[PDB]
Amino acid sequence: QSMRLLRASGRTPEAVQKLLEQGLRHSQDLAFLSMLNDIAAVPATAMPFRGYAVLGGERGGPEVQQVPAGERPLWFICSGMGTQWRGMGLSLMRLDRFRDSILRSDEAVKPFGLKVSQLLLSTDESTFDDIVHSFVSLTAIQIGLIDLLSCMGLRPDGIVGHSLGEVACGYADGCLSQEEAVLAAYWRGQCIKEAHLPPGAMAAVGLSWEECKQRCPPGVVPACHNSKDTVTISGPQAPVFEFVEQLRKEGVFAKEVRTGGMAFHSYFMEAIAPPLLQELKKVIREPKPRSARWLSTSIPEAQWHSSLARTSSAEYNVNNLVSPVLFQEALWHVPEHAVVLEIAPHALLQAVLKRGLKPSCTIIPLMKKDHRDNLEFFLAGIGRLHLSGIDANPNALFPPV
């Protein structure tokens, strides 16, 4: 239970180490650690060294570091599909704001006969093989994460989504409510499940976008633009498996990706638009406008001045499903010293993000697939916010003293 994050500030590295140690020696005094956390909110100007330690737990050990002058912008990246795993979010369930958010999500899905929390609890290995189970639970876990962030008063300067991640983005941007956001994830999944489409596949491929366009066999299209030389292509299964073989053989990095036989973000999805648009029309009534913080990955830049782009409509959401994921192009806009948080039940984009951004950007993941303890991992990440100059007091995550 008692595991807490202790953040420290000071004029020297030693000033910070001494603090981290006093807290370690009073690990069980919550009122004490609460007080030490309130203190750490001191500008780098005044105290240029910062540190953190996760008290309790295995990979507990201090990080200390000089904090740069300059203001650093905070960006949220909401990851897309593939990030599911059995036992997702069970460790974070210990934080009340998280489990409150997940129960609130269960309520959105009481009809339809699903409880997100029970999906998470399932010891059934194949529970997230179901597209609805996954979609809903990704987005619910993303909302939880966003709630934990907001509960420490962290407002994003920028927001960016990847496929289904763009649902979570709406929540983070204040376009879509929790209930709308979750239901959008539900219908997206349920519409597909019902559709019984032909067998498709997607593959990660070490070509550029234009090079894929040229080189891709008919019926196979570049789908997910993740970096200058990482495109996920999508199409009917056979050609996608054949194209990857061709590529492997010629020395190109070309990993297959499990998407449950589905050829996402391609023409294969157009059969799913009419039903989905009908359902989401009833869900997202009175569509609220997307802020300028939220860069679209479903709509090209040169048409951001657009009615479709103007709001997080049922229309915008259907467009996401059917259109390619223009992720690299959105990252291009992320400024030089950004602090970037991957908001996902598993930080799958970390590698892509490193490549698509620079040794100035700090990239922080929040959960890891099959981690012994994702509360430890989450808190270490929040600790790194301190180290990079962001004021995020963990006292909010925990019961008061």
Swiss-Prot record:
Tissue: Ubiquitous. Prominent expression in brain, lung, liver and mammary gland.
PTM description: In adipocytes, S-nitrosylation of Fatty acid synthase occurs under physiological conditions and gradually increases during adipogenesis.
Sites bearing Phosphoserine, chain numbering: 307
Function: Fatty acid synthetase is a multifunctional enzyme that catalyzes the de novo biosynthesis of long-chain saturated fatty acids starting from acetyl-CoA and malonyl-CoA in the presence of NADPH. This multifunctional protein contains 7 catalytic activities and a site for the binding of the prosthetic group 4'-phosphopantetheine of the acyl carrier protein ([ACP]) domain.
Record's subunit section: Homodimer which is arranged in a head to tail fashion. Interacts with CEACAM1; this interaction is insulin and phosphorylation-dependent; reduces fatty-acid synthase activity.
Active site: 163
Subcellular location: Cytoplasm; Melanosome
Taxon lineage: Eukaryota, Metazoa, Chordata, Craniata, Vertebrata
Originating species: Homo sapiens (Human)
Name by which UniProt lists this protein: Fatty acid synthase
TM ranges: none
Binding positions for an acyl-CoA per the UniProt entry: 229-230, 253, 355
Further comment: The relatively low beta-ketoacyl synthase activity may be attributable to the low 4'-phosphopantetheine content of the protein.
Gene designation per UniProt: FASN
Residues with the N6-acetyllysine modification: 18, 110, 255
Acyl and malonyl transferases: region residues: 11-399
